[PDB]
Amino acid sequence: MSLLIRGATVVTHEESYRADVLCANGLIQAIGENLETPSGCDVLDGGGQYLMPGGIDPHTHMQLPFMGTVASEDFFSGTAAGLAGGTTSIIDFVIPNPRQSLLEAFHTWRGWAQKSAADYGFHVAITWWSDEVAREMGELVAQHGVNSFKHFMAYKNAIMAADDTLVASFERCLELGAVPTVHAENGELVFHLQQKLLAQGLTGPEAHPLSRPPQVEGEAASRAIRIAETLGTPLYLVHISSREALDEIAYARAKGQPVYGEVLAGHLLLDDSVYRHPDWATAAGYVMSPPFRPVEHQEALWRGLQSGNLHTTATDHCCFCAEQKAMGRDDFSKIPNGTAGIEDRMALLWDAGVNSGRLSMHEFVALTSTNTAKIFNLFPRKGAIRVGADADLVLWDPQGSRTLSAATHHQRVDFNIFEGRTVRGIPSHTISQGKLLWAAGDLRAEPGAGRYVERPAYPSVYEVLGRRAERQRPVAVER
Amino acid sequence: SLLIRGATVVTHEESYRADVLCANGLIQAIGENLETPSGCDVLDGGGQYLMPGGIDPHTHMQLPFMGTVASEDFFSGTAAGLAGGTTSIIDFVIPNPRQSLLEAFHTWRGWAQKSAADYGFHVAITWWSDEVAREMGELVAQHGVNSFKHFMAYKNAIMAADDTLVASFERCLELGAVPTVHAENGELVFHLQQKLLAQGLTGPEAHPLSRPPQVEGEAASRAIRIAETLGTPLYLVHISSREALDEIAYARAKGQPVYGEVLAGHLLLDDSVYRHPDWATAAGYVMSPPFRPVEHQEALWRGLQSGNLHTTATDHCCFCAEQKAMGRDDFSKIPNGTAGIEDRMALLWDAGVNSGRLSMHEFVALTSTNTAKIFNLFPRKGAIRVGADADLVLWDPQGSRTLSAATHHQRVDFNIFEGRTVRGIPSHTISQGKLLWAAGDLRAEPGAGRYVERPAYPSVYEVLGRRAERQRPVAVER
Ligand SMILES: [Zn+2]
Ligand SMILES: [Zn+2]
Ligand SMILES: [Zn+2]
Ligand SMILES: [Zn+2]
């Protein structure tokens, strides 16, 4: 018990309509025009606003230990700041060291995430292979609510998976009904260009984009895609930044292949000139992988969203303050990679996509929660306004205004990649598991309030794959 | 000296009536009603088309491979070529892993000495070290080699992985050499092979299932993007799939120098051949990449017509029945390869020219001139011009030939086009100014052919160099 949102237009991934919505006991209890108020149930007035599923950010790195160091944003600050921005759940990554047990890395991460203010889940990264990793994956799916496994195709000599691994792991994912996910950059090429730029003496952040140009993403997307086609698995590609990688996804989808693509707001709105800023720390602030790209790539990504070839939005929320960035003051390859975004994603997208008329409100919802839930088999528990669904919601004021700044954001990091940008259309209120956790300026997150969210295996795409595999079965010739 | 009189000269771009005089290995004169020098033999070409002799840039004469040695040797293979209108080859030095390239190279020169017509070599990069790199440089500077092949498949044999591709392509750029690639993802092939064998599918019908088209498309994608990133051209051998062809068109659509090669096999045969109820027949078709579903044939023809595929070849790599039978209980041990050197030109004329898919000019481009230009042999080869080498084919658009292993000159007991009848045939073939095939009479002689050196830095390198210069990485000062 008990929270009634009254007066709003409910906006789903597919329709708009006027209704009141009642939350109790973490769930949406009722939806209708003029609902009755249970006694002492709190009431939020939503006249002239839109009430939508709360955002799900399927790509966070809260307090990740990475590139000599540990991300500035912990599970609490991170998940809180997300709430302030209308995001109600995350999926983060367990990234074991190579040769490290997955169940061990997984219990370590569950540890770190217990302090979450909002619902959370994990993908598990496959950073090495053995019969043991195969075994443990099965357990994570059977016992621990994991149904998606990440592969890094870059970060050579660190966590990179090569073809022999990708093949073995993807086959395992097929066996388990789990979704393979990939960070698609060709690692040998990145490694090769990094050395060559450093050997020429190019050590600045401006050399970061040059060390990993768009065709390096395109290559790796092609390869992850064709391994998935060849093994009979779906595939989810994280943070697509390039035309080249988008074209591979469209090409595969165009042949009937289940491939999904995620995009970050930064890759929709920023270009690679940012790395040439006169101030080192500013430029360094933008360093993440894949990097920001020449302008023609933004337009292409927008169209991918408009055409159904890109499916989800996310942030790759991986915060490093200036002093951490400056670990690579003399060597761009040692700047810790990552930008902040959890709090800003929904407003950035609404303002650039809906106000401009590129995206309908419905696509906005699809791209901010529902597609993610459907892909990872959380629908209709999440990303849905219906009776029985988790009461994760955001109330949106289309005329409200906000100016993005590191000075004022709830993200624990001293840099914002959209510093000074002003957006129209903001989350006035955010509701997580039935509770009002952000209210016109007031953040009310509390450590440990979040739950761990299990995702069942075998999303329905695996039924279709199953029937195809059966129909395609090889038949010997008799002689 | 040899005068060809009364033919229509057909090049990669035009047709005209003229006689052609050859002497001393070379074309001496071209013009209407040329004078006959005394002693000169005269070939009457009235009603026929005189074209450059075909260049086949992909042969494997007497290759030791998959536990045996190809049945066709450098003499029998180049002689069979000449009967087919093909006057020069490019074959492959394939050193074993950890074997010196130079060692392998001289060995292959020995094997090739017996060739009946002009020949040259690509050299395969089957392992990597500083010594390989040094050897590549000596091959280019001293030995007339200007192209290096990389195999993306054949895991635990001659397969190159990304780290070798990158380092080799970079070495290729340094030397002005053309990287070439056999584009199949070896890890997927290897995985599928085991899986299929583990399920007891051991027959030839499983060869194609073990390397479906996307495995080729992936590897073309990857070679292409490595080449783009390192700033080299790229040549992809025997493209069989829409997927690979689409990767080439995509890259050429961004201004990237990528060339594709195609075999007649892959233009005209489909994967149903592998389900033949006779084991030996099905096995005769086993090569890599395998023949594909029909839709890929049409895509390939369209590649030719659009300028996204550039050369034709044969992957001439012959194994007789007893040799193919080494894989009788395991398709993955069937020696991979089919014959085609003799048949390439008539197959293509017949399927492409008679149908109106290709002009005669395109036919010339795709059978000699584009290969010449790509590997820096134009206009010495693939050109009918004074001072060019006198490698010529006289083509009777009315003749007919029926292809058969019982009648072909290829030293192998199987022909992947057994029984097919083509219209338009080479009536005569001239190599080094000499009449080596004359309407059924083959006059090839062991050892007549020459080793043909190809200079480095084809023209594309000047363009890449201007590009590289305009994209100098430039540091921001602070
Ligand atoms: Zn990533
Ligand atoms: Zn990430
Ligand atoms: Zn090959
Ligand atoms: Zn070959």
From Swiss-Prot, chain A:
Binding locations of Zn(2+) 2: K150, H183, H239
Residues bound to substrate: Y155, S289, N337
Record bears the keyword Metal-binding: yes
The enzyme's E.C. designation: 3.5.2.2
Keyword set, alphabetical order: Hydrolase, Metal-binding, Zinc
Cofactor note: Binds 2 Zn(2+) ions per subunit.
PTM section of the record: Carboxylation allows a single lysine to coordinate two zinc ions.
Membrane spanning residue stretches: none
GO CC entries: cytosol
Catalytic reaction annotation: 5,6-dihydrouracil + H2O = 3-(carbamoylamino)propanoate + H(+)
UniProt keyword Hydrolase, yes or no: yes
GO terms for MF: dihydropyrimidinase activity; hydrolase activity, acting on carbon-nitrogen (but not peptide) bonds, in cyclic amides; metal ion binding
Binding site for Zn(2+) 1: H59, H61, K150, D316
Annotated InterPro entries: Amidohydro-rel (IPR006680), Hydantoinase/dihydroPyrase (IPR011778), Metal-dep_hydrolase_composite (IPR011059), Metal_Hydrolase (IPR032466), Metallo-dep_Hydrolases_sf (IPR050378)
Stated family: Belongs to the metallo-dependent hydrolases superfamily. Hydantoinase/dihydropyrimidinase family.
Assembly and binders: Homotetramer.
Family annotation (NCBIfam families): D-hydantoinase
The protein's role, per its UniProt record: Catalyzes the hydrolysis of dihydropyrimidines and of the structurally related DL-5-mono-substituted hydantoins, to produce N-carbamoyl-D-amino acids.
The name this protein goes by in its record: D-hydantoinase/dihydropyrimidinase
Originating species: Pseudomonas aeruginosa (strain ATCC 15692 / DSM 22644 / CIP 104116 / JCM 14847 / LMG 12228 / 1C / PRS 101 / PAO1)
Gene field: dht
